[PDB]
Design a protein around this motif. Structure first.
Motif, PDB file in Angstrom:
ATOM      1  N   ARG A 110       0.830  -1.206   0.000  1.00 13.46           N
ATOM      2  CA  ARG A 110       0.000   0.000   0.000  1.00 13.46           C
ATOM      3  C   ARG A 110       0.865   1.256   0.000  1.00 13.46           C
ATOM      4  O   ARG A 110       1.728   1.402   0.877  1.00 13.46           O
ATOM      5  CB  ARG A 110      -0.943   0.009   1.201  1.00 13.46           C
ATOM      6  CG  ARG A 110      -2.050   1.051   1.096  1.00 13.46           C
ATOM      7  CD  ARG A 110      -3.083   0.892   2.191  1.00 13.46           C
ATOM      8  NE  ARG A 110      -3.423  -0.509   2.406  1.00 13.46           N
ATOM      9  CZ  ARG A 110      -3.484  -1.086   3.598  1.00 13.46           C
ATOM     10  NH1 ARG A 110      -3.240  -0.383   4.693  1.00 13.46           N
ATOM     11  NH2 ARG A 110      -3.795  -2.367   3.695  1.00 13.46           N
ATOM     12  N   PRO A 111       0.687   2.162  -0.967  1.00 13.75           N
ATOM     13  CA  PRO A 111       1.666   3.240  -1.176  1.00 13.75           C
ATOM     14  C   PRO A 111       1.642   4.276  -0.061  1.00 13.75           C
ATOM     15  O   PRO A 111       0.582   4.765   0.334  1.00 13.75           O
ATOM     16  CB  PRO A 111       1.234   3.856  -2.514  1.00 13.75           C
ATOM     17  CG  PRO A 111       0.360   2.831  -3.157  1.00 13.75           C
ATOM     18  CD  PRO A 111      -0.321   2.119  -2.038  1.00 13.75           C
ATOM     19  N   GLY A 112       2.828   4.594   0.450  1.00  9.30           N
ATOM     20  CA  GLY A 112       3.002   5.647   1.423  1.00  9.30           C
ATOM     21  C   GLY A 112       3.088   5.191   2.862  1.00  9.30           C
ATOM     22  O   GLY A 112       3.385   6.019   3.730  1.00  9.30           O
ATOM     23  N   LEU A 113       2.848   3.912   3.139  1.00 10.83           N
ATOM     24  CA  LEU A 113       2.842   3.425   4.511  1.00 10.83           C
ATOM     25  C   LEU A 113       4.249   3.404   5.098  1.00 10.83           C
ATOM     26  O   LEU A 113       5.234   3.138   4.404  1.00 10.83           O
ATOM     27  CB  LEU A 113       2.249   2.016   4.584  1.00 10.83           C
ATOM     28  CG  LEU A 113       0.768   1.757   4.305  1.00 10.83           C
ATOM     29  CD1 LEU A 113       0.345   0.445   4.948  1.00 10.83           C
ATOM     30  CD2 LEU A 113      -0.103   2.893   4.795  1.00 10.83           C
ATOM     31  N   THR A 114       4.330   3.699   6.392  1.00  7.25           N
ATOM     32  CA  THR A 114       5.554   3.483   7.140  1.00  7.25           C
ATOM     33  C   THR A 114       5.818   1.984   7.251  1.00  7.25           C
ATOM     34  O   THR A 114       4.875   1.192   7.236  1.00  7.25           O
ATOM     35  CB  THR A 114       5.439   4.096   8.534  1.00  7.25           C
ATOM     36  OG1 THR A 114       4.312   3.532   9.216  1.00  7.25           O
ATOM     37  CG2 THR A 114       5.260   5.572   8.437  1.00  7.25           C
ATOM     38  N   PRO A 115       7.091   1.568   7.350  1.00  8.22           N
ATOM     39  CA  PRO A 115       7.385   0.126   7.460  1.00  8.22           C
ATOM     40  C   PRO A 115       6.813  -0.532   8.700  1.00  8.22           C
ATOM     41  O   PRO A 115       6.513  -1.732   8.674  1.00  8.22           O
ATOM     42  CB  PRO A 115       8.916   0.078   7.476  1.00  8.22           C
ATOM     43  CG  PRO A 115       9.364   1.365   6.935  1.00  8.22           C
ATOM     44  CD  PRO A 115       8.325   2.371   7.241  1.00  8.22           C
ATOM     45  N   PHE A 116       6.642   0.227   9.781  1.00  8.00           N
ATOM     46  CA  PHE A 116       6.046  -0.324  10.988  1.00  8.00           C
ATOM     47  C   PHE A 116       4.555  -0.596  10.806  1.00  8.00           C
ATOM     48  O   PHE A 116       4.052  -1.630  11.259  1.00  8.00           O
ATOM     49  CB  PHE A 116       6.286   0.624  12.159  1.00  8.00           C
ATOM     50  CG  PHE A 116       5.695   0.149  13.441  1.00  8.00           C
ATOM     51  CD1 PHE A 116       6.334  -0.826  14.181  1.00  8.00           C
ATOM     52  CD2 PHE A 116       4.497   0.669  13.906  1.00  8.00           C
ATOM     53  CE1 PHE A 116       5.792  -1.275  15.355  1.00  8.00           C
ATOM     54  CE2 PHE A 116       3.950   0.212  15.074  1.00  8.00           C
ATOM     55  CZ  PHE A 116       4.607  -0.755  15.803  1.00  8.00           C
ATOM     56  N   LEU A 117       3.829   0.327  10.165  1.00  7.17           N
ATOM     57  CA  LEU A 117       2.388   0.147  10.005  1.00  7.17           C
ATOM     58  C   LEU A 117       2.065  -0.938   8.986  1.00  7.17           C
ATOM     59  O   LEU A 117       1.000  -1.562   9.067  1.00  7.17           O
ATOM     60  CB  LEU A 117       1.723   1.469   9.611  1.00  7.17           C
ATOM     61  CG  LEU A 117       0.195   1.520   9.742  1.00  7.17           C
ATOM     62  CD1 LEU A 117      -0.236   1.451  11.198  1.00  7.17           C
ATOM     63  CD2 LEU A 117      -0.392   2.740   9.063  1.00  7.17           C
ATOM     64  N   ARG A 118       2.959  -1.162   8.016  1.00  5.20           N
ATOM     65  CA  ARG A 118       2.864  -2.346   7.166  1.00  5.20           C
ATOM     66  C   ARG A 118       2.914  -3.613   8.003  1.00  5.20           C
ATOM     67  O   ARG A 118       2.094  -4.520   7.827  1.00  5.20           O
ATOM     68  CB  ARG A 118       3.994  -2.365   6.140  1.00  5.20           C
ATOM     69  CG  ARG A 118       4.049  -1.179   5.227  1.00  5.20           C
ATOM     70  CD  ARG A 118       4.915  -1.469   4.024  1.00  5.20           C
ATOM     71  NE  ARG A 118       5.057  -0.293   3.177  1.00  5.20           N
ATOM     72  CZ  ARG A 118       4.181   0.068   2.248  1.00  5.20           C
ATOM     73  NH1 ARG A 118       3.091  -0.657   2.042  1.00  5.20           N
ATOM     74  NH2 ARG A 118       4.391   1.158   1.526  1.00  5.20           N
ATOM     75  N   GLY A 119       3.862  -3.675   8.939  1.00  4.16           N
ATOM     76  CA  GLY A 119       3.992  -4.844   9.784  1.00  4.16           C
ATOM     77  C   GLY A 119       2.836  -5.037  10.740  1.00  4.16           C
ATOM     78  O   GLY A 119       2.455  -6.173  11.028  1.00  4.16           O
ATOM     79  N   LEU A 120       2.261  -3.940  11.236  1.00  7.13           N
ATOM     80  CA  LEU A 120       1.196  -4.038  12.230  1.00  7.13           C
ATOM     81  C   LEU A 120      -0.081  -4.612  11.629  1.00  7.13           C
ATOM     82  O   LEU A 120      -0.758  -5.424  12.268  1.00  7.13           O
ATOM     83  CB  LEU A 120       0.935  -2.668  12.847  1.00  7.13           C
ATOM     84  CG  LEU A 120       0.176  -2.660  14.172  1.00  7.13           C
ATOM     85  CD1 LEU A 120       1.022  -3.278  15.270  1.00  7.13           C
ATOM     86  CD2 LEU A 120      -0.216  -1.245  14.533  1.00  7.13           C
ATOM     87  N   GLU A 121      -0.419  -4.215  10.401  1.00  8.97           N
ATOM     88  CA  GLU A 121      -1.608  -4.763   9.754  1.00  8.97           C
ATOM     89  C   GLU A 121      -1.387  -6.204   9.310  1.00  8.97           C
ATOM     90  O   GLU A 121      -2.310  -7.025   9.380  1.00  8.97           O
ATOM     91  CB  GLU A 121      -2.013  -3.892   8.566  1.00  8.97           C
ATOM     92  CG  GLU A 121      -3.398  -4.204   8.030  1.00  8.97           C
ATOM     93  CD  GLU A 121      -3.761  -3.367   6.826  1.00  8.97           C
ATOM     94  OE1 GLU A 121      -3.234  -2.244   6.704  1.00  8.97           O
ATOM     95  OE2 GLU A 121      -4.574  -3.830   6.001  1.00  8.97           O
ATOM     96  N   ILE A 122      -0.178  -6.524   8.835  1.00  9.83           N
ATOM     97  CA  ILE A 122       0.150  -7.898   8.462  1.00  9.83           C
ATOM     98  C   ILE A 122       0.138  -8.799   9.690  1.00  9.83           C
ATOM     99  O   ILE A 122      -0.386  -9.921   9.649  1.00  9.83           O
ATOM    100  CB  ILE A 122       1.508  -7.940   7.730  1.00  9.83           C
ATOM    101  CG1 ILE A 122       1.389  -7.335   6.334  1.00  9.83           C
ATOM    102  CG2 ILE A 122       2.040  -9.362   7.603  1.00  9.83           C
ATOM    103  CD1 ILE A 122       2.717  -7.003   5.707  1.00  9.83           C
ATOM    104  N   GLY A 123       0.674  -8.304  10.808  1.00 11.12           N
ATOM    105  CA  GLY A 123       0.697  -9.093  12.030  1.00 11.12           C
ATOM    106  C   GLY A 123      -0.689  -9.351  12.591  1.00 11.12           C
ATOM    107  O   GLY A 123      -1.048 -10.501  12.859  1.00 11.12           O
ATOM    108  N   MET A 124      -1.497  -8.288  12.731  1.00 14.21           N
ATOM    109  CA  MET A 124      -2.836  -8.390  13.318  1.00 14.21           C
ATOM    110  C   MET A 124      -3.743  -9.329  12.538  1.00 14.21           C
ATOM    111  O   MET A 124      -4.575 -10.022  13.134  1.00 14.21           O
ATOM    112  CB  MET A 124      -3.491  -7.013  13.389  1.00 14.21           C
ATOM    113  CG  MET A 124      -3.046  -6.141  14.535  1.00 14.21           C
ATOM    114  SD  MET A 124      -3.354  -4.411  14.148  1.00 14.21           S
ATOM    115  CE  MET A 124      -5.137  -4.358  14.286  1.00 14.21           C
ATOM    116  N   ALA A 125      -3.588  -9.376  11.217  1.00 10.61           N
ATOM    117  CA  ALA A 125      -4.346 -10.334  10.423  1.00 10.61           C
ATOM    118  C   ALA A 125      -3.849 -11.752  10.653  1.00 10.61           C
ATOM    119  O   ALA A 125      -4.647 -12.695  10.699  1.00 10.61           O
ATOM    120  CB  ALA A 125      -4.262  -9.969   8.943  1.00 10.61           C
TER     121      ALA A 125
END
Ligand code: F6C
Ligand code: CLA
Ligand code: CLA
Ligand code: CLA
Ligand code: CLA
Ligand code: CLA
Ligand code: CLA
Ligand code: CLA
Ligand SMILES: CC1=C(/C=C/C(C)=C/C=C/C(C)=C/C=C/C=C(C)/C=C/C=C(C)/C=C/C2=C(C)CCCC2(C)C)C(C)(C)CCC1
Ligand SMILES: CC1=C(/C=C/C(C)=C/C=C/C(C)=C/C=C/C=C(C)/C=C/C=C(C)/C=C/C2=C(C)CCCC2(C)C)C(C)(C)CCC1
Ligand SMILES: CC1=C(C/C=C(\C)CCC[C@H](C)CCC[C@H](C)CCCC(C)C)C(=O)c2ccccc2C1=O
Ligand SMILES: [Ca+2]
Ligand SMILES: [Ca+2]
Lengths: 727, 80, 98, 41, 172, 31, 116
Positions: E45-60
């Motif tokens: 998803r364009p523009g996301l911080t690397p941490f917020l990429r991980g948080l959504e991937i993790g929570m799912a």
């Protein structure tokens, strides 16, 4: 700019919240879209029509699925008079235990809704008997809708996109729709009635596994070929036939009885099979009239062009304008939907539906409000035609040029009939109000409806004793002297001269006053719509109105003031008058039938002649159990209708905010809120679209939407709860 | 933006130019009427659509016509 | 590039907002022969200076409503007002009189 | 039967999950998807 | 016989218009539906911080990884034991996977990396091209998948009260 | 009797076919 | 911001909500309320940033905006604030949930009943 909406570049550059609302309200106006070529217009309408067809088939597939899954259809067909149809189950986790107990009704073991649409009575007559029948019908429509979704996608593909000349072929369509859509479908429906619906009415199961074995007739298919067609008019049905069972049953499949089946109180399935067979072959004949590809056949433009001293150009006006066709077809569909409502209650066609009083009230009010909506959209799209598609040189001196020149005579004659009916009907009602209030109820002016009483006598009522021409035994209209072949009549006259049915009810002086109030509501609603259509191109207040479009707010406060001057705002005004007219219609139908069904038909007759009697004995008296659906004494099964009753009163009141308060009050209030948001700490949000008040046209539409939703949810809750709790 | 059209029935009375609160309209020489001048609308991207110019026009029917078009920030009159 | 004293004014809540810094701004400049009170188009009363004035406003309609007041509510009249449109990059365009 | 929501029909766990999914679980993702569709440039 | 080949339209095209590349443009990798879906997944998803990429991937991911051991695992005969063993399974897989993410980044980003994380790599499918993007994705996946696992654990441990909520039994 | 659990699951699986065909009709009609 | 907000959002449904007649049910419904509000608010923070920061943003997040009250001027500041509010408000909610679920032992701690 934004990408949304893709069809309007000027809406893309709108920086306010007006962009999102105007993108909705113009999304299906394909002609005003960016770069819409006139051939691409027809191809997107054709694919949108396949999408609307699939939504209809998915809708009826869900009705069949939820009855088969959660209804009581197999329990209801045992005794349809002592059972109650279940619509679907209730899953609302905010329910308390008194609400769970109140909606665990009709012999169900979970909370359910009572079906009031009549689909149980409709499926039972056409031969559905099991929940497995309703399931495969639901699966078949689930695949039929996916065929409609395929054909919409397919006819948008470049090889399968039809050209413009295919869309303008008004002879190949009118032949195929008369003979195939109207004829072959009515022929195939007779084939369902005599192969399936008639044996299941006589106890014989006919399904897809055993219909190639069982004949529809004992003399199977041979009396049709040998020309002895009276061998299908066998022993029709005895007067002691029980529906769905073999006892008292006949073998006839096409009969001409008339009247009603005595047990089900509905039309005979043999009269309905001979109806759709006579309708089929007449429609198949009518579909062989116009020339397409083979030389034989009439040509529709020749009958129009060679019709003068006035129909020159009327073909090309019809054929080239989609708004002329839409306004024409909405007018024809609006008359028929009224005719569906007026004839389904008088001659009930479905078994035991005339004793489901809440269904008959719901079905009449449904199809009458639908018909009133199609009627005002016929005039609305006939007014969009006069602004957008009407050519004054292609229609010079023809009939469309006549009324635009006659427009001050048509509107002024509609205004006199409107003022005459309103002065004298309200004058008679207020006079009868002041006589009953001042203790003299026999000083009321009670004009007897002598014209429609004689019209009832000419149809078969001997109740008035005037004994002439089909109220007559030895009439020439009764005996049918050259024929003696009116087989309908001896069955028909028991439908007229019985007191329990609902065709040709007895009318009195309270019935005359409401028919003139209905005539007042028809003439004013026509007067708003005709004047809005005939002044749509221009008036003396605004002569260049056609270059401003169908919908615009005003022309400013100059020239005296020009609020609500467009043709759209005459639609907006006539919608209030349509709802008030259909209010008066369905009030009269419901109060007359609540008096007939209770046996208190006398109490309608003294109280309907003055307006307090409608107020006290219809509105106030029938609200008593509706508003007691929940109370400090507890809650019952009318609680969702009591809550919807207040919901409808609430939406009607929210409507008055949008209709009384106008725009610049709200626009200056939003600037103070935009000030407060910019100067508040910790409020990190900021509107991407600039907040503006709703536009002048939009809040007339939003206010009309809340008015209409508030109108229908109020009366619809009152109609269900007052009828189902009294019966 | 809106569209302000001036038609050739204009008698050049300069009353639409005086009435305009956005200074959309000006007078240009014309030689098509007795006053020798006609109204024009050069700065029509500043037009808010108030129709004060049509209220001021004495010609029957009006020589100046405002057609409400695409809404911009200027035509919606937004200070925010 | 724009000269003038700001009029004596305590400020108000009707003045410049986020739009004035990110889209466009307006300034009206006029000369007065005396110190006198005028009404701000944003609400309230301000004091113009003797000599050259300069006032930044949010809309072009606010500057032209001020210039209408300067031409009509003061004897002698103040006719020499100039209205500019200021862009966020500092680019100033002279728009009234044209 | 009278104290809570039950179902005497086939798969009565289906309204137990579909009404939470349709009405208060999925709408805010659908509203967010529609919001990104109408705001994108 | 072959001269009119490659003249009519085909839904299968060379990848990025280059027939020398070792891929094809199919409906599965290049249609508008799958490109809108895949490029808006939190990995892309364009523009996301690397941490917020991980948080959504993790929570799912931590949410569903509790599931299998609850229903078919060795503790499944009792409800409280099955939820605990499902939580510990999701915790152990998450720590092992996030240890793998961290040691991938410690091994790959040493100077100019080889392969798909080289500075000259036009790999659109592997866009996390720095080691600080990988370490923030590692911490995001750890915190999200721990939170998603303990969220599924709390819902399954309180299933008796949560079933009573969803049937209206709490309104008695 | 009413529907079985295998009849309801058949209807849910079949209804994915007009769900997919309405998606490809909606995206073809336009954005 | 999250840890302060998720902590108090457990509160209202515990005391006045529909599960309030039993202690364990009221704490669970208060935790789920704080979880649902947090996910919805952090979804709103993320889709605000995805909509606003497209090129030069309009309004208060434009490069020329002197908005002292809105200083988070980049989209990576907004996505890190979104993940921070999510993790803090989830942690603050489950902290209030753990204190309220163990209120009987926590009341015994604060009255010295654990020293018997
Ligand atoms: C987004 C962002 C934002 C922000 C931040 O950030 C805000 C803020 C403010 C402050 C400052 C103030 C105060 C608060 C209160 O109290 O109020 C309530 C509100 C609320 C609660 C709102 C809030 C919201 C939140 C914040 C967010 C949430 C979201 C969700 C959760 C998500 C979900 C998602 C999904 C997809 C669905 C306000 C206000 C006002 N608003 Mg205002 N907002 C906004 C939004 C909005 C919109 C959309 C609209 C339209 C509807 C409006 C409207 C309005 C009006 C009328 C008014 C008033 O009156 C007020 C005032 O001014 O005073 C003075 N406004 N605000
Ligand atoms: C807080 C107000 C509220 C909310 C959010 C709901 C929500 C719902 N109701 Mg409920 N209902 C309410 C008040 C409410 N109801 C009240 C006060 C009553 C009278 C006791 C009912 C009686 C009722 C009935 C009879 C039915 C519903 C159903 C429903 C469901 C879908 C219908 C709908 O809302 O249409 C949105 C468009 C949805 C779960 C329907 C259902 O369970 O279908 C799944 C249904 O048949 N409700
Ligand atoms: C015989 C061949 C044939 C048939 C069966 C049809 C059928 C149809 N075409 Mg047509 N079409 C044809 C040939 C045919 N076409 C040819 C050759 C051309 C080229 C010249 C066209 C050009 C064409 C166009 C451009 C369009 C159609 C459309 C339609 C549909 C009309 C909408 C509708 O569903 O109403 C169905 C109507 C009935 C079933 C009859 C209703 C009669 C009254 C109103 C009701 C009476 C029934 C009864 C009393 C009610 C009982 C029901 C109740 C118990 C539930 C219908 C499916 C439209 C469409 O929607 O496309 C998808 C459309 O836009 N056609
Ligand atoms: C088969 C019936 C039918 C069809 C195909 C249409 C089709 C149309 N109508 Mg019509 N109309 C109809 C029945 C129909 N209508 C009825 C029954 C009424 C009376 C209620 C009207 C009253 C009406 C008005 C007053 C107007 C239209 C307009 C339109 C056009 C654009 C609609 C739009 O973009 O809004 C899309 C709407 C939505 C996406 C949601 C609206 C929900 C409402 C507000 C609640 C479109 C050609 C408009 C037009 O042609 O402009 C020149 C227009 O102004 N219609
Ligand atoms: C002056 C009154 C008047 C009369 C007596 C007629 C008579 C007729 N009209 Mg006409 N009609 C009129 C005015 C009139 N029209 C006006 C002013 C309009 C425009 C609204 C129409 C719109 C119209 C259409 C669209 C059609 C007719 C048709 C017809 C013919 C119908 C024959 C039939 O039953 O099939 C009949 C000759 C039909 C026809 O053309 O048959 C020749 C036909 O299709 N009429
Ligand atoms: C109690 C409510 C009420 C009443 C009595 C009226 C009465 C009238 N309306 Mg009005 N109307 C109403 C509400 C009402 N309206 C609402 C809420 C709207 C929506 C804004 C309209 C929109 C509307 C339109 C668009 C039109 C009318 C017209 C009329 C006149 C119809 C002709 C007639 O019947 O003359 C008899 C007079 C009366 C029944 C009332 C007079 C009072 C008596 C004599 C005591 C004095 C009549 C004066 C029409 C008209 O003026 O045609 C000539 C017309 O075109 N009305
Ligand atoms: C257009 C409708 C209408 C008609 C046809 C009548 C006709 C009549 N009224 Mg009525 N009346 C009307 C409207 C009407 N009124 C209204 C709107 C009111 C309320 C102000 C009344 C209140 C009224 C009273 C109080 C009385 C009449 C009376 C009469 C009768 C007197 C005849 C006479 O010689 O003078 C006559 C039958 C008188 C009568 O004899 O009653 C029948 C009488 O005492 N009228
Ligand atoms: C369009 C017709 C239609 C309508 C108005 C309804 C209405 C309803 N359904 Mg039903 N449903 C339908 C068709 C329909 N259904 C079909 C054909 C199936 C078989 C796949 C189902 C399978 C189904 C299940 C398993 C459940 C419902 C439930 C419900 C109720 C709550 C809403 C919900 O959770 O839906 C959920 C919807 C689905 C699971 C699939 C819907 C499929 C249709 C065709 C989509 C229609 C889209 C529409 C045309 C687009 C506009 C509501 C009364 C719930 C209920 O009964 O609670 C008491 C429930 O648990 N429906
Ligand atoms: C079918 C389909 C599909 C698929 C889908 C899927 C696969 C799904 C999944 C789903 C899932 C997989 C989900 C997930 C979810 C998750 C979640 C939502 C989570 C949450 C979390 C939380 C809430 C947590 C919290 C916390 C924390 C963080 C810490 C502290 C504690 C707590 C717990 C509080 C698709 C689209 C492809 C296509 C179409 C169809
Ligand atoms: C009075 C006053 C005021 C106010 C104040 C207030 C309003 C307060 C608030 C308060 C609050 C609102 C608080 C909060 C708190 C919170 C907290 C402190 C939290 C914590 C958290 C935690 C501790 C968590 C943890 C965790 C995690 C993170 C994860 C895992 C799990 C756990 C749980 C472990 C003022 C200043 C204005 C002024 C003066 C006066
Ligand atoms: C209340 C009101 C508003 C204010 C309402 C606005 C600005 C819309 C508010 C919409 C919010 C976002 C809630 C939307 C809820 C809907 C059910 C969706 C107007 O802008 C207006 C304009 C012209 C005439 C009358 C009125 C009017 O009555
Ligand atoms: Ca074990
Ligand atoms: Ca409770």
């Amino acid at each position: 700019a934004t990408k949304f909406p893709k069809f309007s570049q000027d809406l893309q550059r709108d920086p306010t919240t007006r962009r999102l609302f105007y993108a909705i309200a113009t999304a299906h106006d394909f002609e005003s879209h960016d770069g819409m070529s006139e051939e691409n217009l027809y191809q997107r309408i054709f694919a949108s029509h396949f999408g609307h067809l699939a939504i209809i088939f998915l809708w009826i597939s869900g009705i069949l699925f939820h009855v088969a899954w959660q209804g009581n259809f197999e329990q209801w067909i045992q005794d349809p008079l002592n059972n109650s149809p279940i619509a679907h189950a209730i899953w609302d986790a905010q329910f308390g235990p008194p609400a769970i107990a109140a909606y665990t009704q009709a012999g169900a073991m979970n909370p359910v809704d009572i079906c009031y649409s009549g689909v149980y009575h409709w499926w039972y007559t056409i031969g559905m008997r099991t929940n497995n029948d309703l399931f495969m019908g639901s699966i078949f429509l689930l695949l039929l809708s996916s065929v409609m979704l395929y054909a919409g996608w397919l006819h948008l593909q470049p090889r399968f996109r039809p050209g413009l000349a295919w869309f303008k072929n008004a002879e190949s369509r009118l032949n195929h729709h008369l003979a195939g859509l109207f004829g072959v479908s009515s022929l195939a429906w007779t084939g369902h009635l005599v192969h399936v619906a008639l044996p299941e009415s006589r106890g014989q199961h006919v399904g897809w596994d055993n219909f190639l074995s069982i004949r529809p007739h004992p003399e199977g298919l041979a009396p049709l070929f040998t020309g002895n067609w009276g061998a299908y008019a066998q022993n029709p049905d005895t007067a002691e036939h029980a529906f769905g069972t073999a006892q008292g049953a006949g073998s006839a499949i096409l009969t001409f009885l008339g009247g009603f089946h005595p047990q089900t109180e509905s039309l005979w399935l043999t009269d309905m099979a001979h109806h759709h067979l006579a309708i089929a072959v007449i429609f198949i004949v009518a579909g062989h009239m116009y020339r397409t590809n083979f030389g034989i056949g009439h040509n529709i433009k020749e009958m129009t062009e060679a019709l003068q001293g006035g129909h020159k150009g009327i073909y090309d006006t019809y054929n080239n304008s989609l708004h002329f066709q839409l306004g024409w077809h909405l007018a024809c569909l609006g008359v028929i939907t009224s005719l569906v409502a007026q004839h389904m209650y008088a001659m009930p066609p479905y078994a035991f539906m005339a004793r489901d009083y809440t269904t008959m009230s719901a079905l009449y009010t449904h199809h009458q409000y639908i018909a009133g909506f199609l009627m005002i959209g016929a005039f609305a799209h006939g007014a969009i035609f006069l602004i957008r598609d009407y050519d004054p040189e292609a229609n010079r001196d023809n009939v469309l040029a006549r009324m635009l020149a006659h427009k001050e005579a048509i509107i002024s004659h509609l205004s006199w009939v409107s003022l005459f009916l309103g002065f004298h009907t309200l004058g008679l009602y207020v006079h009868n109000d002041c006589e009953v209030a001042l203790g003299s109820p026999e000083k009321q002016i009670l004009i007897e409806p002598v014209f429609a009483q004689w019209t009832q006598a000419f149809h078969g009522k001997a109740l008035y004793g005037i004994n002439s021409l089909l109220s007559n035994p030895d009439s020439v209209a009764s005996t049918a002297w050259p024929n003696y072949g009116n087989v309908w009549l001896s069955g028909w006259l028991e439908a007229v001269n019985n007191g329990a049915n609902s065709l040709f009810l007895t009318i009195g002086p309270g019935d005359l006053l409401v028919h003139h109030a209905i005539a007042l509501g028809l003439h004013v609603t026509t007067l708003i719509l005709v004047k809005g259509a005939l002044d749509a191109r221009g008036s003396k207040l605004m002569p260049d109105k056609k270059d401003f479009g169908y919908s615009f707010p005003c022309d400013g406060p100059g020239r005296g003031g020009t609020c609500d001057i467009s043709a759209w705002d005459a639609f907006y005004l006539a919608t209030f008058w349509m709802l008030n007219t259909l209010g008066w219609v369905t009030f009269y139908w419901h109060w007359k039938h609540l008096s007939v069904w209770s046996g208190n038909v006398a109490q309608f007759n003294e109280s309907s002649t003055y307006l307090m009697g409608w107020f006290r004995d219809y509105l106030w008296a029938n609200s008593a159990q509706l508003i007691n659906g929940y109370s400090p004494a507890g809650t019952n099964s009318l609680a969702v209708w009591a809550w919807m009753f207040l919901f409808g009163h609430l939406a009607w009141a929210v409507s008055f905010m949008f209709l009384i308060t106008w725009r610049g009050y709200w626009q200056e209030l939003i600037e103070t809120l935009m000030w407060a948001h910019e100067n508040t700490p910790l409020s990190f949000g900021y509107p991407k679209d600039k907040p503006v008040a709703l536009s002048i046209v939009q809040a007339r539409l939003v206010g009309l939407t809340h008015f209409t939703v508030g109108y229908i949810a109020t009366y619809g809750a009152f109609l269900i709860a007052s009828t189902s709790s009294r019966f | 933006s809106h569209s302000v059209k001036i038609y050739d029935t204009c008698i050049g009375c300069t009353q639409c130019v005086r009435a305009c609160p956005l200074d959309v309209l000006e007078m240009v020489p014309w030689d098509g009427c007795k006053a020798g001048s006609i109204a024009s609308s050069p700065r029509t991207e500043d037009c808010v659509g108030c129709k004060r110019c049509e209220t001021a026009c004495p010609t029957d029917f009006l020589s100046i016509r405002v057609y409400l078009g695409a809404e911009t920030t200027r035509s919606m009159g937004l200070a925010y | 590039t724009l000269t003038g004293k700001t009029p004596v004014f305590g400020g108000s809540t009707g003045g410049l907002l986020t739009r004035a810094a990110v889209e466009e701004k307006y300034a009206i400049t006029w000369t007065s022969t005396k110190q006198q009170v005028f009404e701000m188009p944003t609400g309230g009363a301000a004091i113009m200076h003797e000599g050259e004035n300069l006032l930044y406003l949010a809309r072009k309609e606010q500057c032209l409503a001020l210039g209408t007041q300067l031409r009509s509510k003061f004897k002698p009249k103040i006719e020499d007002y100039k209205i500019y449109r200021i862009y966020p990059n500092g680019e100033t365009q002279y728009v009234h009189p044209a | 039967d009278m104290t809570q929501l039950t179902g005497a029909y086939a798969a009565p766990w289906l309204p137990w999950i579909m009404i939470p999914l349709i009405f208060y679980i999925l709408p805010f993702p659908i509203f967010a998807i529609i919001f990104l569709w109408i705001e994108r440039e | 016989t072959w001269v009119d080949a490659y003249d009519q339209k085909d839904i299968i095209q060379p990848y990025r218009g280059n027939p020398e590349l070792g891929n094809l443009a199919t409906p599965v990798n290049s249609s508008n539906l799958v490109k809108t879906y895949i490029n808006n997944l939190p990995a892309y998803r364009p523009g996301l911080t690397p941490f917020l990429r991980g948080l959504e991937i993790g929570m799912a991911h931590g949410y569903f990884l509790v599931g299998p051991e609850v229903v078919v695992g060795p503790l499944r005969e009792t409800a409280h034991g099955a939820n605990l063993s499902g939580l510990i399974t999701a915790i152990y897989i998450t720590v092992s996977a996030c240890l793998g993410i961290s040691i991938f980044a410690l091994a790959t980003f040493q100077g100019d990396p080889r392969g798909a994380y080289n500075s000259n790599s036009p790999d659109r499918l592997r866009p996390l091209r720095s080691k600080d993007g990988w370490f923030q994705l590692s911490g995001g996946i750890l915190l999200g998948s721990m939170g998603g696992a303990i969220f599924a654990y709390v819902l399954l441990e309180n299933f008796g009260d949560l079933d009573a909520i969803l049937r209206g039994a709490v309104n008695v | 009797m009413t529907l079985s659990e295998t009849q309801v699951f058949v209807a849910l699986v079949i209804a994915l076919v007009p769900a997919i065909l309405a998606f490809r009709l909606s995206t073809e009609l336009y954005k």
